[PDB]
């Protein structure tokens, strides 16, 4: 006796459906965590480590030993994923524009978009419309954005929101509690009173406090996206099945399989540029327990920001000369673009 087996069914691709992945899903898809900066053992054999990059439990890049995960050789190993995790969250550089647009769209205090219910009515009418095209969705993006930038208070929470401004490349700030050209509101009193002890211990703060702005850095921005009401999400034009907004902020990365990045000369660009990320993480975790000041802590944080950005593409401009890249490098974008 035996159960009938459907041997093979001829199958044809119908669609390619793009989308993002949330860090939880990202863990679920990968195979091993990688936790080591180094890649070979100290001994003479040049054998690869068991938990570093280039562990052959992810793939093969040579002819003489198999991939452990599926026990076959370089001829037919389809490659498998690992993952790494970052101590502090990070902007994706790619979707950076999306992050700033979302932050401009939402209310910074209550996470509800600043729409009147008539506007919501019209706009959900446009959404039900059959045959939505990319051009058309761009159009609703334009009209949404226009009808929402010109509004200052929030109907839902009763507060009012400033504007978001670039404060250097790959960091963003907001114009909330500055001194205002419309003259400051009585809330300036509690502002002033809040720096009382700071001024008493440091009088140099007093000349400076009038220039303060809202410090929405990646971590607090991430905490904000965790809270958008489920109703609003489609009105941000994101397909709710593709991805939640939190995925635009990343706390884990995939290491691609070895077959993407073979290694014999014996370096390969991504295999080493990625070693720097895992290096810097080890630093900040060691630095996490040092008793060091806030200063160098946030430096070693944003240095990840520089590194991830260079991991995706190498042509960024707003990089100061003292840690500007020393040489050309092939991120992902460089190997997709070009003749």
């Amino acid at each position: 006796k035996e159960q009938f087996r459907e041997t093979d069914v001829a199958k044809k691709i119908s669609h390619i459906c793009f989308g993002m992945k949330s860090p939880e899903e990202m863990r679920q898809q990968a195979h091993i965590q990688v936790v080591s900066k180094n890649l070979y053992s100290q001994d003479n054999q040049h054998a690869p480590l068991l938990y570093g990059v280039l562990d052959h439990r992810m793939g093969t890049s040579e002819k003489d030993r198999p991939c452990e995960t599926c026990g076959k050789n370089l001829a037919d190993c389809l490659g498998h994923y690992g993952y790494i995790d970052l101590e502090l969250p990070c902007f994706h550089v790619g979707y950076f524009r999306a992050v700033i647009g979302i932050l401009q769209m939402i209310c910074k205090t209550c996470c509800h978009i600043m729409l009147s219910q008539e506007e919501k009515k019209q706009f959900l009418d446009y959404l039900k419309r059959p045959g939505l095209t990319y051009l058309q969705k761009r159009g609703l993006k334009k009209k949404i954005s226009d009808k929402c930038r010109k509004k200052n208070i929030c109907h839902h929470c009763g507060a009012f929101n400033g504007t978001v401004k670039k404060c250097g490349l790959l960091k963003i700030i907001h114009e909330k509690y500055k001194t205002n050209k419309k003259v400051v509101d009585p809330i300036v009193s509690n502002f002033l009173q809040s720096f009382e002890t700071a001024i008493e211990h440091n009088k140099e703060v007093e000349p400076l406090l009038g220039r303060a702005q809202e410090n929405l850095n990646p971590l607090v921005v991430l905490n904000l996206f965790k809270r958008i009401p489920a109703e609003d999400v489609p009105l941000l034009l994101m397909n709710p099945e593709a991805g939640k907004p939190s995925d635009l902020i990343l706390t884990r990365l995939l290491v691609p399989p070895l077959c993407i990045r073979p290694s014999v000369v014996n370096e390969d660009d991504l295999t080493m540029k990625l070693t720097e990320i895992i290096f810097l993480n080890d630093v900040i975790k060691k630095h996490r327990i040092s008793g060091a000041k806030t200063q160098m802590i946030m430096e070693d944080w944003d240095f990840l920001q520089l590194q991830c950005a260079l991991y995706i593409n190498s042509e960024l401009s707003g990089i100061p000369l003292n840690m500007a890249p020393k040489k050309w490098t092939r991120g992902f974008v460089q190997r997709l673009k070009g003749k």
């Binding site: 093979d8 069914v9 001829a10 199958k11 044809k12 691709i13 119908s14 669609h15 390619i16 459906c17 793009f18 989308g19 993002m20 992945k21 679920q28 898809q29 195979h31 599926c70 076959k72 389809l78 490659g79 498998h80 994923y81 994706h92 790619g94 995925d247 990343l250 990365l253 995939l254 290491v255 691609p256 399989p257 077959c259 993407i260 995706i312 992902f332 190997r335 997709l336």
Partner: protein, 97 residues
């Protein structure tokens, strides 16, 4: 491979892909850019839309939904090169008729 020093065969550029289109040759274009250059065979899980291996889908933990396609190797490479970039092409399957 690329050149006569290493016996690389000859390149059928984009500009001959166009001349082959104009004649309306559909089987010769397929033959001359897939089944001779770099045809390859791959496992796809129909339920989740990701790739799998050896008839298994490590993502879903099952061997029932997987299926084997013919595909250019360069495309197989392209998807794996996009996922890590945090852009994910999920595949939706259907019958061949």
């Amino acid at each position: 491979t690329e050149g006569r020093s290493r016996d690389g065969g000859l390149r059928l550029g984009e500009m001959e892909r166009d001349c082959l289109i104009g004649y309306g040759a559909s089987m010769l274009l397929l033959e001359r850019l897939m089944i001779s250059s770099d045809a390859f065979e791959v496992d796809v899980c129909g339920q989740c839309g990701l790739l799998g291996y050896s008839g298994w889908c490590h993502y879903c933990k099952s061997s029932c939904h997987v299926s084997s396609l013919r595909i250019p190797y360069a495309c197989k490479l392209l998807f794996q090169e996009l996922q890590s970039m945090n852009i994910i092409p999920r595949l939706k399957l259907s019958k061949y008729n």
